[PDB]
Design a protein around this ligand. Structure first.
Ligand SMILES: C=C1CCC[C@@H]2[C@@](C)(CC3=CC(=O)C=CC3=O)[C@H](C)CC[C@]12C
Ligand SMILES: C=C1CCC[C@@H]2[C@@](C)(CC3=CC(=O)C=CC3=O)[C@H](C)CC[C@]12C
Ligand SMILES: O=P(O)(O)C(O)(Cn1ccnc1)P(=O)(O)O
Ligand SMILES: O=P(O)(O)C(O)(Cn1ccnc1)P(=O)(O)O
Ligand SMILES: [Mg+2]
Ligand SMILES: [Mg+2]
Ligand SMILES: [Mg+2]
Ligand SMILES: [Mg+2]
Ligand SMILES: [Mg+2]
Ligand SMILES: [Mg+2]
Lengths: 346, 346
């Protein structure tokens, strides 16, 4: 709602992002075709999602900066840093789609699945990542938060890469152990792979933009935002099987890819020993009838109801955590973002 | 020789690089297995090469800093930033080996060809890249060049990514045009893909470390170092076909992968029209007997002698350029590095 009003202005800022990334180096004409490829890379892989992470930067920045400091320029930078978060997303997703062997993202074919792209997508991703640092220098080089922002985006990438390594190490292809799929391991994976970049990064970005740089106000924000990130990823895992691909824009692969999904952890916690074996025989394999058998087993332990039950308790806990740690920040910052992910199905 | 003395001290600094990258986050035990994977990623993909780029940082830093400023700490940082260049290399190479479909690198199997790695290598690469920025913060956070160094490593990555995009766009699989393979296009490709990160980056890194930050002293260094980078890449293209894989540590793929190699550009400049057609029919295809036919054609126009002739003229020109633009820097800086690549065959 605070999100939904601001969407349109934020999406229109994208034409200029692209202009400035295409223009400022087209005074080197020799790379023109590279630049043209960048444009394509951006339009295919930055557009088409819900923009919530990039919107979170703009919304929070509105709520933390005094409106007499929100000049036209200061807002440009807010929307630009918003788009920097978006490009980080795009970067990890393009590479994740390859490592996860996914088919669709945001309602279209994955970039690496497009005829004539393939594993060139690897360098496409890396460019998306560089564009972040290009814009920071363009729009924020002279701000006193410029270095905070750079360290923040770099630190959040390392964290999410450490998370992916854990994601991939725990899901080796053609190689079961059910046994590594614990709660402790799960929470660790999801903390690093999703929670820093999807929640802490954008709010912190907007904190540094407003001049709130103190270690304690960041750690407290962090406490709320990691826990919301855990919830968000459990939701992502539930939607990978039980979501509607016309809503989510994507087809699940967690069972196939042998993943430490929340579903499988819960499953294992509930399974009779012979249910265990059915899982053993059928998990992490590409065969459609073996996936279907796992799903049935999940359904047979009411894991969709266990998800709906988790969602309520997590929500109540995040809200407790907001009552606890929001101060001295406006609680609307956390509340608007919790509203945005509660009940969600894309 | 200045290189060859300093090698051993530089390579021994690698144990500590790895220690500090493994230690400083092992106070989070939950990621321990990620960290262990990093260690592996580093030992396989940072070790085994000639270290010339990372050595160039240490050598030049010795030559530009007054020896009364080369305290133990100041040298730590030199060797560390040396290793940061090395990790940039490692990052691009791991990804290049995938996009080039290569077999071996540095005398062993490519990381992505190892059983149980595969396309997980994508995230391995990204980590290598993050490690650069981790070390900069660890060893240089309080230096007045810290931000110059960060912008330099980021800018050099964007440039080399723009170069790779050009490299890949000009070499679409199963799709000849001989016709895009010009001199102008060639020089552009090689400038961006190799010349900034392999030559300008390390010397500039060492300039910023010595407090030489002026735009004019950088542009002049740049003028020498881009041209040396062009030469170095033409050498790389010649070795891809005519090099000895026990020296180079790697097997060629430029013809197979349909690349704008220097060899093919030269070829096209020399070809009778019916030689042209032989090239047309045989270039950019995986079939061993069609590659052999191209090689024969290259040999039939004495392109190895044309390479030996280019090498001499380029050398004389780089030396002219050094006479022109080295000032006020010690010419030994450029000379030691030109000695290192003249006559080279790994
Ligand atoms: C799984 C996700 C969680 C993180 C967000 C991300 C978005 C919503 C896109 C998006 C673009 C942007 O510019 C800024 C923020 C964004 O969130 C995509 C569509 C689907 C959900 C996904 C992939
Ligand atoms: C093609 C190249 C040109 C750039 C350098 C690079 C090295 C020599 C490794 C290396 C490691 C390091 O830490 C610092 C510098 C380095 O050069 C590898 C072995 C082969 C040549 C290669 C791949
Ligand atoms: O399930 P994943 O972690 O691979 C995913 O959530 C992507 N992602 C990657 C890192 N954090 C989130 P997606 O379902 O978008 O494929
Ligand atoms: O030939 P390439 O450019 O792919 C190569 O030189 C790697 N490289 C990549 C960018 N710059 C240099 P290598 O021969 O090492 O595979
Ligand atoms: Mg995925
Ligand atoms: Mg994934
Ligand atoms: Mg998922
Ligand atoms: Mg290659
Ligand atoms: Mg290549
Ligand atoms: Mg080569």
């Amino acid at each position: 709602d605070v999100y939904a009003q601001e969407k349109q202005d934020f999406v229109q800022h994208f034409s200029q992002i692209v202009r400035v990334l295409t223009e400022d180096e087209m005074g080197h004409p020799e790379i023109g075709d590279a630049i043209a490829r960048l444009k394509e890379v951006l339009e295919y892989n930055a557009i088409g999602g819900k923009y919530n992470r990039g919107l979170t930067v703009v919304v929070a920045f509105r709520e933390l900066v005094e409106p007499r400091k929100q000049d036209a320029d200061s807002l440009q930078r807010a929307w630009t840093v918003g788009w920097c978060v978006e490009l980080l997303q795009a970067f990890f997703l393009v590479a994740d789609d390859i490592m996860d062997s996914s088919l669709t993202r945001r309602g279209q074919i994955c970039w690496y699945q497009k005829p004539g792209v393939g594993l060139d997508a690897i360098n496409d991703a890396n460019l998306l990542e560089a564009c972040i640092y290009r814009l920071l220098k363009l729009y924020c080089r002279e701000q006193p938060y410029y270095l905070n922002l750079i360290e923040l985006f770099l630190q959040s990438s390392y964290q999410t890469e450490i998370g992916q390594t854990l994601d991939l190490l725990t899901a080796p292809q053609g190689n079961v152990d059910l046994v590594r799929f614990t709660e402790k391991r799960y929470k660790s994976i999801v903390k690093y792979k999703t929670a820093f970049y999807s929640f802490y990064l954008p709010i912190a970005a907007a904190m540094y933009m407003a001049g709130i740089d103190g270690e304690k106000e960041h750690a407290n924000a962090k406490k709320i935002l990691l826990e919301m990130g855990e919830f968000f990823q459990i939701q992502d895992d539930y939607l990978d099987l039980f979501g509607d691909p016309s809503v989510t824009g994507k087809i699940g692969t967690d069972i196939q890819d042998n993943k430490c999904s929340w579903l499988v952890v819960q499953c294992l916690q509930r399974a009779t020993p012979e249910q265990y074996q059915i899982l053993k025989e059928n998990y992490g394999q590409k065969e459609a009838e073996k996936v279907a058998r796992v799903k049935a087993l999940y359904e047979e332990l009411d894991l969709p109801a266990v998800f709906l039950q988790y969602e309520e308790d997590s929500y109540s806990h995040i809200m407790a955590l907001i009552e606890q740690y929001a101060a001295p920040l406006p609680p609307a910052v956390f509340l608007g973002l919790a509203r945005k992910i509660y009940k969600r199905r894309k």
